[PDB]
Design a protein around this ligand. Structure first.
Ligand SMILES: CC(=O)N[C@@H]1[C@@H](O)[C@H](O)[C@@H](CO)O[C@H]1O
Ligand SMILES: [Ca+2]
Length: 522
């Protein structure tokens, strides 16, 4: 019975996973090692690109409509339903959880837990925990969230009953907005040699009309002072009106959480960027909106990647303990980001879309002896598969537990690095957060090996992208006659998957419908 160390970041883009020569914009040595000692799944996707929905999928091995948590709303997750933590706890595991939970309800199946209230805070984080009395308390811990989460995790591991296999879930806030790096990492990231993606200035042509209404563009939807860290006090009052997108001028909340010592180190560094902005404005260069948008991009890249430096550190402190305790051969290590992120592709940030960047989520596994070390796996895997995989690896895959899952165990492919003969030809995706922050439409679809077919419910628009001929998904080929029969093929496959996954009709629902509520079912 192996231990299970499960590390889950918030908004980690696979473009920056750090496993190889093509996903390392910043060098992440410990990310690369875990790659070298294990398996990366380059074809790893989620079922709903949002933090709360994806966490519920991982937990239940079931799609959003089946597990009930379909968006980041104030409706708590049904913690009474079957979850792999509770399954493992029933198979003798000791269970622990530290950091981002974000499912509202008290975590079930976990002997220990201390989670952030909501998104959490990078600097001087608050934690919530039941007392031995079991009444929720809230305590603040000094330090940087990525460090403190690792601190608590490792401590919990050494205080563990070493005769029971453990489940430890390590949920980081990084790399999540507003992308505040640790003080020791300020300046360590140099983007001035980086070039925005080919479609940074995307005009949205040959894509559904609704995409022009998205509010997750680097150029028009970033808080200049909060996201991009600019200092208002050092910007001429005359200039503030020309640097702030309308409604996007709010302050950086983390500053209120820093101590004076901390607060100064931060402003001391970020006066450079603030000056760099003022220089590009008075010189006129930053007044061309396309230039301003690229400048925005570079700051965004600096701070996002900067955050990954302490994640990388976290990965190192956790992997070191495993080795010094001599249990790496008896520990399944799963790393993932709850879903992916736009690193400027289509001039966008965040997730929520069926487009490849946010439909993917980075997946890495290390099980020495069991999982071929150094393999990149191209099998199509989804976040609804994790729970059946954790349970199998735990010998708790009774027919009872396994039946509650819609995902497929990944051990066969994890053990060989290749696609088994009978593998799914397509996954199903569905996003429900409209109306919602960032104005993503309610939409769903399937992802096949070659294609992406999505129906946008909010705007009543279909879209097909041919990945073999268009991996940047810039030309909607639905309504191209060459793909006529393909659309027919796919549309049937689409409706078949909806029927197999027991998707309700009129879900996720178009503009005339409320965001659906579901009771958990299995
Ligand atoms: C201002 C801000 O932080 N906005 C973020 C948003 O971008 C993100 O999508 C959401 C949860 O993912 O949390 C919001 O708070
Ligand atoms: Ca997330």
């Amino acid at each position: 019975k192996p231990n299970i160390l499960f590390i889950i970041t918030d908004d980690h883009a696979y473009q920056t996973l750090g496993t190889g020569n093509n996903d390392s914009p910043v060098a992440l040595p410990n990310f690369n090692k875990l790659g070298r000692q294990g398996m990366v799944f380059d074809r790893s996707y989620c079922a709903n690109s949002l933090c709360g929905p994806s966490r519920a999928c991982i937990l239940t091995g079931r799609h959003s409509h089946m597990n009930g948590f379909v968006f980041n709303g104030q409706r708590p997750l049904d913690g009474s339903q079957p979850t792999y933590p509770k399954m493992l706890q029933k198979a003798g595991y000791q269970t622990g959880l530290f950091g981002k939970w974000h499912l509202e309800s008290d975590p079930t199946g976990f002997d220990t837990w201390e989670i952030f209230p909501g998104q959490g805070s990078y600097y001087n984080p608050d934690f919530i925990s039941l007392k031995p009395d079991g009444k929720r308390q809230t305590k603040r811990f000094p330090g940087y969230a990525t460090d403190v989460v690792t601190d608590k995790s490792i401590q919990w591991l050494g205080n563990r009953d070493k005769n029971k296999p453990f489940l430890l879930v390590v949920g980081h806030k990084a790399p999540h907005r507003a992308w505040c790096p640790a003080l020791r990492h300020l300046g360590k990231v140099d983007t001035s040699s980086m070039t925005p993606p080919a479609n940074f200035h995307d005009d949205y042509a040959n894509r559904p009309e609704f995409l022009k209404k998205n509010q997750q563009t680097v150029a028009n939807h970033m808080a200049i002072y909060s996201d991009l860290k600019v200092l208002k006090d050092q910007v001429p009052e005359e200039m503030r009106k020309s640097i702030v997108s309308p409604g996007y001028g709010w302050d950086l909340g983390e500053l209120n959480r820093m101590t004076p010592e901390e607060k100064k180190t931060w402003t001391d560094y970020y006066a450079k960027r603030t000056k760099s902005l003022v220089d590009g404005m008075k010189s006129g260069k930053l007044k061309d909106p396309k230039a301003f948008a690229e400048w925005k991009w570079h700051a965004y890249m600096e701070d996002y990647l900067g955050c990954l430096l302490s994640v990388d550190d976290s990965i190192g402190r956790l992997m070191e303990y495993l080795d010094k305790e001599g249990i790496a051969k008896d520990t399944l290590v799963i790393y993932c980001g709850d879903q992916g992120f736009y690193m400027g592709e289509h001039g966008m940030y965040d997730k929520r879309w069926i487009f490849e960047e946010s439909l993917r989520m980075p997946l890495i596994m290390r099980w020495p002896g069991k999982i071929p070390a150094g393999i990149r796996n191209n099998t199509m895997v989804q976040n609804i598969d994790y729970a059946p995989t954790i349970v199998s690896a735990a010998g708790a895959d009774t027919p009872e537990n396994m039946n509650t899952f819609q995902g497929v165990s990944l051990l066969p492919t994890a053990f060989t690095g290749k696609t088994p003969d009978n593998w799914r030809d397509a996954i199903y995706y569905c996003f429900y957060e409209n109306p919602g922050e960032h104005n993503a439409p309610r939409h769903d679809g399937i992802r096949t090996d070659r294609y992406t077919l999505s129906y946008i419910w909010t705007s009543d628009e279909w879209m097909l992208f041919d990945m073999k001929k268009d991996p940047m998904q810039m030309k909607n080929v639905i309504d191209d006659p060459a793909y006529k029969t393909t659309v027919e093929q796919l549309k049937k496959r689409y409706h078949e998957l909806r029927k197999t996954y027991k998707v309700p009709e009129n879900s996720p629902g178009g503009k005339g419908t409320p965001i659906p509520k579901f009771d958990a079912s299995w």
